[PDB]
Amino acid sequence: MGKSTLKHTRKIQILIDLPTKDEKKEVMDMMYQWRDRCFRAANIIVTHLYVQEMIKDFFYLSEGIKYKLADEKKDEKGILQRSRMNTTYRVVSDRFKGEMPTNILSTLNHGLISSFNKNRVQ
DNA sequence: CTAGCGACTAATTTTTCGGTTCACGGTCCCACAACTAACGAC
């Protein structure tokens, strides 16, 4: 069956449901920290998904090697030790865990790794 | 419930027309002004 839906987005205002000011402020500061960690994360993922392609290019300029993004346990020419999205998610979680939730990391990882493969041509 | 994963503008000059000056052999009709001949008063 075809897609019988069209994606849509709505803006819902939310207040923090706490009695006192200090708890609300603690939650709001935690969420601002979440913002900062998310942006630093996005930077880390994009750098870490740039570098390896240029390592591929380096090897190809060395001996025309056909190195490709795949787990070496599943590919002879693979260099990665796991799935690429897992590599970015790991290299961001190992540093930013315990401060902001990991679902933000997973969503950001998917959102950037999906687009970067399309941007490979450019 | 969370974490790993798939060149334009201003200044100066020059020129045609107008102004000024000199100044010897039909008709018919209705009014209006004369106007004058006769008539009456001193």
Contact A89/A105 with Cβ under 8 angstroms? Answer: yes
* Residue type (1 letter), A57: D
CA distances from A41 to A11, A31, A52, A94, A110 (A): 24, 15, 17, 11, 13
CA distances from A117 to A82, A98, A112 (A): 17, 30, 9
Contact A84/A69 with Cβ under 8 angstroms? Answer: yes
CA distances from A37 to A17, A31, A88 (A): 24, 10, 15
Residues linked to residue A71 through DSSP beta bridges, in sequence order: A80
**Strand B reaches within 7 A of the A97 CB:** yes
Contact A44/A92 with Cβ under 8 angstroms? Answer: yes
At which residue do the structure tokens 């402020």 appear? A25
What's CA A44's distance to the chain center, in Å? 8
Structure tokens at A1: 């069956």
Using a 7 Å cut-off to protein CB atoms, list the covered nucleotides of chain B: 2-6
- CA A99/CA A103 separation, integer angstroms: 12
Structure tokens at A14: 């939310």
Resolution (A): 2.9
Q: To 10 degrees, the CA torsion angle through A72, A75, A77, A81?
A: -20
- CA A97/CA A83 separation, integer angstroms: 20
Q: What sections of chain A are H helices per DSSP?
A: 21-63, 84-96, 102-119
Give, in Å, how far the C1' of B20 lies from the CA of A65: 113
**Strand B reaches within 7 A of the A93 CB:** yes
**Strand B reaches within 7 A of the A82 CB:** yes
Structure tokens at A82: 């796991």
Give, in Å, how far the C1' of B33 lies from the CA of A42: 132
**Strand B reaches within 7 A of the A35 CB:** no
Burial of residue A90, with CB atoms counted within 10 A of its CB: 0-12 exposed, 13-18 middle, 19 or more buried:
middle
Contact A52/A79 with Cβ under 8 angstroms? Answer: yes
